[PDB]
Design a protein around this motif. Structure first.
Motif, mmCIF file in Angstrom:
data_model
loop_
_atom_site.group_PDB
_atom_site.id
_atom_site.type_symbol
_atom_site.label_atom_id
_atom_site.label_comp_id
_atom_site.label_asym_id
_atom_site.label_seq_id
_atom_site.Cartn_x
_atom_site.Cartn_y
_atom_site.Cartn_z
ATOM 1 N N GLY A 109 0.613 -1.292 0.014
ATOM 2 C CA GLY A 109 -0.195 -0.206 0.040
ATOM 3 C C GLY A 109 0.796 1.205 0.535
ATOM 4 O O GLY A 109 1.968 0.990 -0.126
ATOM 5 N N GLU A 110 -0.093 2.366 -0.041
ATOM 6 C CA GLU A 110 0.822 3.566 -0.011
ATOM 7 C C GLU A 110 1.015 4.341 1.273
ATOM 8 O O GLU A 110 -0.687 4.661 1.427
ATOM 9 N N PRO A 111 1.254 5.616 1.338
ATOM 10 C CA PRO A 111 1.273 5.907 2.652
ATOM 11 C C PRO A 111 0.283 6.728 3.085
ATOM 12 O O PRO A 111 0.138 7.890 1.702
ATOM 13 N N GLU A 112 -0.282 7.637 4.005
ATOM 14 C CA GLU A 112 -1.474 7.937 3.700
ATOM 15 C C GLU A 112 -0.659 10.023 3.842
ATOM 16 O O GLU A 112 0.349 10.038 3.645
ATOM 17 N N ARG A 113 -2.387 10.010 3.043
ATOM 18 C CA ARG A 113 -1.810 11.493 2.973
ATOM 19 C C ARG A 113 -1.291 12.587 4.216
ATOM 20 O O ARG A 113 -1.783 12.406 4.988
ATOM 21 N N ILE A 114 -0.592 13.464 3.810
ATOM 22 C CA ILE A 114 -0.121 14.484 5.285
ATOM 23 C C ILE A 114 -1.050 14.990 5.357
ATOM 24 O O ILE A 114 -1.467 15.950 4.384
ATOM 25 N N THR A 115 -2.290 15.342 6.284
ATOM 26 C CA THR A 115 -3.768 15.953 6.583
ATOM 27 C C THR A 115 -3.006 16.761 7.783
ATOM 28 O O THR A 115 -2.885 16.829 8.206
ATOM 29 N N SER A 116 -3.096 18.673 7.357
ATOM 30 C CA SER A 116 -3.031 19.717 8.556
ATOM 31 C C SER A 116 -3.654 18.807 9.787
ATOM 32 O O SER A 116 -4.668 18.602 9.862
ATOM 33 N N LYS A 117 -3.146 19.350 10.799
ATOM 34 C CA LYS A 117 -4.368 19.402 12.070
ATOM 35 C C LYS A 117 -4.300 20.731 13.223
ATOM 36 O O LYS A 117 -4.365 21.061 14.113
ATOM 37 N N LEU A 118 -3.924 21.922 12.617
ATOM 38 C CA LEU A 118 -3.988 22.886 12.651
ATOM 39 C C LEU A 118 -4.945 23.655 12.898
ATOM 40 O O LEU A 118 -5.484 24.619 14.230
ATOM 41 N N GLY A 119 -6.479 23.132 12.491
ATOM 42 C CA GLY A 119 -7.700 23.520 12.694
ATOM 43 C C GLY A 119 -8.042 23.129 14.272
ATOM 44 O O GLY A 119 -9.448 22.554 14.327
ATOM 45 N N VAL A 120 -7.347 23.578 15.038
ATOM 46 C CA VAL A 120 -7.906 23.097 16.957
ATOM 47 C C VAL A 120 -8.132 24.021 17.670
ATOM 48 O O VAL A 120 -7.315 24.772 16.933
ATOM 49 N N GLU A 121 -9.313 24.387 18.257
ATOM 50 C CA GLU A 121 -9.670 25.387 19.023
ATOM 51 C C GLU A 121 -8.072 25.767 19.877
ATOM 52 O O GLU A 121 -7.349 26.472 19.993
ATOM 53 N N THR A 122 -7.444 23.898 20.655
ATOM 54 C CA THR A 122 -6.257 24.459 21.726
ATOM 55 C C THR A 122 -5.207 25.173 21.078
ATOM 56 O O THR A 122 -4.600 26.125 21.425
ATOM 57 N N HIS A 123 -4.617 24.620 19.241
ATOM 58 C CA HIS A 123 -3.944 24.808 18.968
ATOM 59 C C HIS A 123 -3.564 26.374 18.209
ATOM 60 O O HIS A 123 -3.242 26.515 18.017
ATOM 61 N N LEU A 124 -5.252 26.768 17.874
ATOM 62 C CA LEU A 124 -5.494 27.659 17.473
ATOM 63 C C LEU A 124 -5.181 28.815 18.730
ATOM 64 O O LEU A 124 -4.593 30.210 18.442
ATOM 65 N N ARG A 125 -5.571 28.791 19.105
ATOM 66 C CA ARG A 125 -4.761 29.635 21.018
ATOM 67 C C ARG A 125 -4.318 29.660 20.793
ATOM 68 O O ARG A 125 -3.810 30.855 21.802
ATOM 69 N N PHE A 126 -3.678 28.425 21.473
ATOM 70 C CA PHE A 126 -2.075 28.417 21.916
ATOM 71 C C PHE A 126 -1.234 28.983 20.911
ATOM 72 O O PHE A 126 -0.441 30.532 21.665
ATOM 73 N N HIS A 127 -1.202 29.068 19.750
ATOM 74 C CA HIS A 127 -0.391 29.934 18.474
ATOM 75 C C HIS A 127 -1.039 31.668 18.297
ATOM 76 O O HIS A 127 -0.259 32.556 18.308
ATOM 77 N N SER A 128 -2.624 31.773 18.589
ATOM 78 C CA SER A 128 -3.032 32.600 18.546
ATOM 79 C C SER A 128 -2.369 33.579 19.267
ATOM 80 O O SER A 128 -1.611 34.760 19.327
#
Length: 683
Positions: free
Chosen positions: A397-416
């Motif tokens: 098989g082929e490796p899964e596609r790299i999907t961004s994970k930035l779209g989360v409350e915690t991470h948005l909050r932390f970085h904002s």
DNA sequence: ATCGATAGTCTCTAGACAGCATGTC
DNA sequence: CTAGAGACTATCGAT
């Protein structure tokens, strides 16, 4: 000749001193890109070419008079890649390294041509307005595929975006693993790319099922009947080193002890049995030494970092014939081996769930010693059930596609908060423009106004950001950002510490309430944690009902703090470990995390007037009662030697000097000297 | 008035980054 | 959801 030819020749002459001693990087298509000054994304199965290729780009950039910042996802890698760049020092290159754990004093850092650090560290160095951070021309982001990680993903996206927004002439080079959408990363990076699946040592992937292994070399297979404990002895005999990835520390240890029976009858280190029991002994450490002596070795996050390196080094020296590991050295340090065995495609993550194809492909990729084996093997042990998934979806098989994970409350909050503090945003409007250059945007074209405004309102209540005419940080916010802690962590601290003062466990537990803290697991037998918490209840910053659906999360916080309590009340390390059902690596990790947070709790506490935590940070660092603080500040003086002295009247550097003869009797002739030797210096 | 085996059941589960300022037994 | 080993317990039976 301006600078291009020069760099290429220098790189060439250098490759000669190494190509004689790490192999060869064919196809100059890539190497051409290297000296292109243009952003580049290198995707290759093995870190092989990736790093070397990457080294040339920084040396080249170095020669033109620019500075490169090589970012890594792990401390160890930062070191490994550091001691490795120690070679380009010849040509007059100054290497560096800056982690949140270790930093090079060797050179003024801000004058190095290649500064190695970790992602989050790099981000922090920015947050803490570093000076040299603004003279970095080339940004090499190793393991760029970790962009997919729910944990590490967002930071890479943010790191890169901030860097680029600064030095508009910055050259970004990201090294990645194979994955369908690598070109998407490259596009996001506005960079020429170079995707290859070339491996120094070809790799045959097999599938053991019902006493039968079937290899896969090209188009034709090769079936054969064998048992697992044989697949090892085959390779052990050839002194090829076998890697057995297990899913649990329990599995790792079990297997290692059995495989030791086999290895035992091939080698006997006994010398290594020492360097393992050196730093710590007791149950686990003992069992590990008894495996290393017979030539085997289990390896997971429970071992001390020392016991870690010992095992790794010895595995290369051939002293260790087999290493049975968990997800640790899967993507940690370079440990080659002819054979590699995945014992299971599953892993507990909510429930027993199969690991990403990427994970497997990334394990098997270590199979094959460059310059020793004519081929590398990677066997997957599966049963009737998943054999087909193994072969079809995994082996082929082929490796899964790299999907961004930035779209989360915690991470948005932390970085904002950070983005607002560092100056990139100043209105909910620019804040969105910022998130527009994200690998999340270039992947979803979605707008984030709802959550971003939500996240910002959150920070508003918590008083980390104020809206006077535009978005701006409060002293607390700038402090929370500089401290690199979750805004919720800093709010819990600031809130509680401005309404009450805490005792030992009180403030300790306060740390264990925070999201940034690691918590211990409560088990069937930790019935004593409940009673203990009840007793301490008036000293805790809150106390839930037995009926609360959160009582169990509460006991988890308590058990963790109680452990931290025993650590600063000078309890024996192994006693701690056997008591809370954890291993030495665990204790040091927990303890090390608590100090970082303890430090933040205290700075937030001081700004708000509270002073009931002062002294706690230093106590946690050393694991001593307050009275020993003056002794433990002295180099070579820890919690044990400190107590031994203090109880004997020696309680500070002065007493140590004026009674050197008593000291030596109490802590050792050797040590005593070294200790005194140190006193005299800072004195 | 008993220790006892066999079977259904319950419990448990990987890893590791940051502040600050230099070194445990 | 896509698990599997080992501790724990109960439940029936022969003495």
């Amino acid at each position: 000749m301006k600078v291009e030819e020069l760099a290429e020749s220098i790189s060439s002459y250098a490759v000669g001193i190494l190509k004689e001693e790490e192999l060869f990087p064919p196809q100059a298509e890539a190497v051409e890109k290297v000296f292109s000054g243009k952003n580049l994304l290198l995707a290759m199965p093995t870190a092989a070419g990736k790093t070397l290729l990457a080294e040339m780009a920084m040396v080249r950039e170095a020669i033109k008079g620019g500075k490169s910042l090589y970012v890594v996802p792990l401390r160890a890698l930062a070191g490994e890649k550091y001691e490795s760049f120690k070679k380009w020092e010849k040509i007059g290159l100054r290497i560096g390294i800056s982690t949140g754990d270790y930093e090079s004093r060797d050179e003024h850092l801000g004058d190095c041509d290649i500064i190695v650090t970790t992602s989050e560290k790099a981000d922090s160095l920015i947050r803490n307005r570093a000076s040299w951070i603004k003279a970095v021309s080339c940004l090499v982001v190793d393991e760029i595929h970790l962009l997919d990680s729910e944990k590490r993903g967002a930071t890479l996206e943010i790191l890169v975006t901030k860097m680029r927004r600064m030095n508009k002439a910055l050259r970004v080079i990201g090294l990645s693993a194979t994955a369908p959408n690598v070109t998407e990363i490259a596009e996001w990076l506005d960079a020429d790319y170079y995707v290859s699946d070339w491996r120094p040592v070809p790799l045959v992937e097999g599938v053991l099922c019902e006493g039968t292994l079937e290899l896969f070399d090209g188009a034709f297979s090769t079936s054969r009947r064998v048992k697992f404990e044989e697949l090892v002895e085959e390779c052990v005999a050839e002194n090829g080193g076998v890697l057995v990835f297990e899913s649990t520390r329990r599995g790792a240890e079990k297997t290692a002890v059995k495989l030791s029976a086999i290895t035992a009858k091939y080698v006997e280190n006994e010398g290594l049995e020492k360097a393992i029991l050196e730093e710590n002994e007791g149950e686990m450490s003992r069992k590990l030494a008894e495996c290393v002596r017979k030539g085997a070795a289990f390896h997971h996050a429970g071992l001390l970092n020392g016991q870690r390196r010992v095992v790794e080094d010895a595995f290369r020296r051939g002293n260790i014939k087999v290493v049975v590991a968990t997800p640790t050295l899967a993507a940690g340090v370079n440990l080659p081996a002819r054979r590699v065995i995945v014992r299971s495609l599953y892993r507990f993550d909510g429930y027993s769930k199969r690991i990403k194809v990427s994970e497997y492909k990334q394990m098997a990729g270590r199979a094959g010693r460059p310059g020793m084996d004519e081929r590398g093997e990677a066997i997957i042990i599966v049963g009737k059930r998943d054999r087909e998934i193994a072969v079809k979806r995994y082996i082929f098989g082929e490796p899964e596609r790299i999907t961004s994970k930035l779209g989360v409350e915690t991470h948005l909050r932390f970085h904002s908060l950070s983005i607002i503090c560092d100056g990139y945003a100043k209105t909910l409007e620019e804040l969105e423009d910022f998130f527009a250059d994200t690998f999340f945007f270039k992947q979803n074209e979605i707008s984030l106004s709802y959550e971003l405004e939500r996240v910002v309102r959150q920070l508003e209540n918590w008083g980390m950001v104020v809206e006077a005419a535009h978005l701006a940080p409060t002293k607390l916010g700038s402090l929370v950002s500089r401290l690199y802690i979750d805004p919720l962590t800093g709010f819990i601290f600031h809130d509680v510490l401005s309404r009450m003062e805490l005792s030992d466990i009180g403030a300790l537990h306060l740390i264990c309430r925070t999201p940034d803290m690691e918590r211990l697991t409560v088990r069937k037998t930790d019935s004593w944690v409940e009673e203990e918490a009840f007793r301490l209840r008036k000293e805790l910053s809150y106390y839930p009902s037995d009926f609360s659906v959160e009582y169990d999360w509460f006991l988890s916080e308590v058990k963790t703090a109680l452990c931290l309590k025993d650590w600063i009340e000078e309890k024996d390390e192994d006693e701690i470990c056997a008591k809370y059902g954890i291993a030495p690596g665990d204790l040091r990790r927990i303890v090390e995390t608590a100090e970082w947070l303890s430090n933040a709790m205290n700075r937030i506490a001081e700004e708000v007037g509270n002073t009931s935590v002062s002294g706690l940070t230093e106590r946690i660092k050393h694991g001593v009662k307050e009275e020993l603080l003056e002794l433990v500040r002295i180099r070579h003086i820890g919690r044990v030697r400190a107590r031994k002295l203090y109880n004997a009247g020696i309680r500070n550097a002065e007493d140590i000097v004026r009674h050197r003869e008593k000291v030596a009797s109490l802590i050792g002739r050797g040590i005593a000297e070294r200790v005194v030797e140190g006193i005299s210096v800072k004195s």
